[PDB]
Amino acid sequence: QKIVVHLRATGGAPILKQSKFKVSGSDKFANVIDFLRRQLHSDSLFVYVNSAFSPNPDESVIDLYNNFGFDGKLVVNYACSM
Amino acid sequence: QKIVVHLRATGGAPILKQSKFKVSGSDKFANVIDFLRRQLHSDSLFVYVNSAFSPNPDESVIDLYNNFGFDGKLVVNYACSMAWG
Amino acid sequence: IPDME
């Protein structure tokens, strides 16, 4: 029933006194977000997770770079099994 | 606005002799994929870019963990600002 | 062992 949530502070956001907690997986994610804001008391807050993204081959390399590029570079990964 | 594309092999993928190529930003992504296949000669090939993803508050914590969790753990990152890009 | 809520 329990999943352990690590709350990792990025990009100048404050570090929390308790970085991890166990939470029942049936609650809505809002619970987690509201809980952050309660502890931070910060107007702005972004909450995001890493993810993979498989672009359509018909997509122009520029539009990709605009979205997932920096410094005139994009890092594209490839695999043969997954 | 010509872009250098770095090719990182993941999940045990074969090594390239030269893991970068410069490309016109008007080219289609296909160009990048075709270029890999030319060098690899592998039937199977997954090609993706890793991005950040803000799930909808109406999503059940389990379904999230199934998709973006590992080892009974879910790693959520959070910030108050962003650098601009 | 930490418990949220």
Swiss-Prot record, chain B:
Biological processes per GO annotation: autophagosome assembly; autophagy; protein transport
What does the entry state regarding organ or tissue expression?
Answer: Ubiquitous.
* Listed GO CC annotations: cytoplasm
Q: Where is it located?
A: Cytoplasm
Q: Which UniProt keywords apply?
A: Acetylation, Autophagy, Cytoplasm, Isopeptide bond, Protein transport, Transport, Ubl conjugation pathway
Principal location: cytoplasm
* InterPro entries xref list: Atg12 (IPR007242), Ubiquitin-like_domsf (IPR029071)
Does Acetylation appear among the keywords? yes
Iron is among the record's keywords? no
Annotated crosslink Glycyl lysine isopeptide (Gly-Lys) (interchain with K-128 in ATG5) location:
85
Pfam families xref list: APG12
Annotated function = Ubiquitin-like protein involved in cytoplasm to vacuole transport (Cvt) and autophagy vesicles formation. Conjugation with ATG5 through a ubiquitin-like conjugating system involving also ATG7 as an E1-like activating enzyme and ATG10 as an E2-like conjugating enzyme, is essential for its function. ATG12/ATG5 conjugate has an essential role in plant nutrient recycling.
The family classification in the record reads: Belongs to the ATG12 family.
Return the protein name: Ubiquitin-like protein ATG12B
Q: Which gene is the coding source of this polypeptide chain?
A: ATG12B
Swiss-Prot record, chain C:
What top-level branch of life does the organism fall under? Eukaryota
Compartments it resides in = Cytoplasm
Report quaternary structure and partners: Also interacts with the C-terminal region of the E1-like ATG7 enzyme.
Q: Which family, according to the similarity comment?
A: Belongs to the ATG3 family.
Biological role stated in the UniProt entry: E2 conjugating enzyme responsible for the E2-like covalent binding of phosphatidylethanolamine to the C-terminal Gly of ATG8. This step is required for the membrane association of ATG8. The formation of the ATG8-phosphatidylethanolamine conjugate is essential for autophagy and for the cytoplasm to vacuole transport (Cvt).
The entry's protein name is Autophagy-related protein 3
Q: Which residues of the full protein are shown?
A: 154 to 158 of 313
